[PDB]
C-alpha cells in the first residue's frame, strides 16, 4: 500500500481480524518480530499491530502477483491447521499446493518423482515448516511466511505478522491473501465483496463433520 486510499484496510477487514483472533500473538517473542507489534499486555499476550499485518500482506500479494506463471508459486502447509486453506488458495490462484508431509529433497534432489522448481514459496509456519525453508535457501527460492511473535526469521524474505496457531486466523489470512492477489490481478472488482466466504478456508476437524452432518 503506497499510501493508496483504495488499498487501505477497511472496517469489515478489522472486524474479521478481531473475530478470528489474528491480533493475539504468543506469550514468547523473537526479537526480530518486535518491529511488528503494539505492546505486551499484563497477561503476557503480545498484541500484533494489524496495520502492519495489512501492509505486509499487501507486500506479499504484490510479490505473488509479479510472477507470470502462477504455478511457479508453491504454497506449503504440513500441520492440519493450514491444509485445506492451502488447497483452497491453489483453487483461487493456480499455485502448486504441498499439503501434508514435505518430502526432504523436493527442491534439491533432481532425481526424484516429486522434484519441482518453484519461483516463490509461501508458507504457513516457519517453525513447523522449517525443512522447505532450509531447502528454499539451498535453491535460491524467495520465501513468504505467516509468522507469529515467536517465529524465527531465518531465510524469510516477507514475514506477515499474524496469529498462525488458531484455525480461523490461519484460514482468514490465507483467504485475504488469495483475495488481494486476485484483486491486484484484476479478476475481481474491489468495490464488490468477494463471493467466496472465508469459512471455506478453515480447518474442518472431523468431529465437527459428525456434529454438523447430524444437524443437517
Amino acid at each position: 500500500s503506497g499510501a493508496l486510499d483504495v488499498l487501505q484496510m477497511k472496517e469489515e477487514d478489522v472486524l474479521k481480524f478481531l473475530a478470528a483472533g489474528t491480533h493475539l500473538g504468543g506469550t514468547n517473542l523473537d526479537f526480530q518480530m518486535e518491529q511488528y507489534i503494539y505492546k505486551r499486555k499484563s497477561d503476557g499476550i503480545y498484541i500484533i499491530n494489524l496495520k502492519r499485518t495489512w501492509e505486509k500482506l499487501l507486500l506479499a500479494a504484490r510479490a505473488i502477483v509479479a510472477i507470470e506463471n502462477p504455478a511457479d508459486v508453491s504454497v506449503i502447509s504440513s500441520r492440519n491447521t493450514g491444509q485445506r486453506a492451502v488447497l483452497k488458495f491453489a483453487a483461487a490462484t493456480g499455485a502448486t499446493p504441498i499439503a501434508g508431509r514435505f518430502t526432504p529433497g523436493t527442491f534439491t534432489n533432481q532425481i526424484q518423482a516429486a522434484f519441482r522448481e518453484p519461483r516463490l514459496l509461501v508458507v504457513t509456519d516457519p517453525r513447523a515448516d522449517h525443512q522447505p525453508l532450509t531447502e528454499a535457501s539451498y535453491v535460491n527460492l524467495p520465501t513468504i511466511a505467516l509468522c507469529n511473535t515467536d517465529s524465527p526469521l531465518r531465510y524469510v524474505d516477507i514475514a506477515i505478522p499474524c496469529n498462525n496457531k488458531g484455525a480461523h486466523s490461519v484460514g482468514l489470512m490465507w483467504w485475504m491473501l488469495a483475495r488481494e492477489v486476485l484483486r491486484m490481478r484484476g479478476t475481481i472488482s474491489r468495490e464488490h465483496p468477494w463471493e467466496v466466504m472465508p469459512d471455506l478456508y478453515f480447518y474442518r476437524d472431523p468431529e465437527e463433520i459428525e456434529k454438523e452432518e447430524q444437524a443437517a
Binding site: L4, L7, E55, L59, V65, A66, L153
Partner: protein
C-alpha cells in the same frame, strides 16, 4: 575489468546486494532476487512494472532480509509511512 584501450575485459559483472552492497557470488545459492509488483494509483491493479531487490545469502542467514526488504520498500514508496 577495463584496460587502457578501453575494452571491457571481464567475463561478467556480478550483481550486488540491495541491503549490504556486497557482491553476490557465483555459488551463493541462498541469494534472492525478488520482484515486487507496483500498481496503478487509481484502480489498484497490476500495472505491469515492478521493483527488483537482490538480497545476498548472508543477510538471509542473519534473519535480516525481512527488515531489509521492508526498508527498501519504504524507500521505493511501495510500503507507506507508518
Amino acid at each position: 575489468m577495463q584496460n587502457d584501450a578501453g575494452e571491457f575485459v571481464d567475463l561478467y559483472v556480478p550483481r550486488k546486494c540491495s541491503a549490504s552492497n556486497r557482491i553476490i557470488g557465483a555459488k551463493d545459492h541462498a541469494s534472492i532476487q525478488m520482484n515486487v509488483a507496483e500498481v496503478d494509483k487509481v484502480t489498484g491493479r497490476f500495472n505491469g512494472q515492478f521493483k527488483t531487490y537482490a538480497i545476498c545469502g548472508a543477510i538471509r542467514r542473519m534473519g535480516e532480509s525481512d527488515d531489509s526488504i521492508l526498508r527498501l520498500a519504504k524507500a521505493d514508496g511501495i510500503v507507506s509511512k507508518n
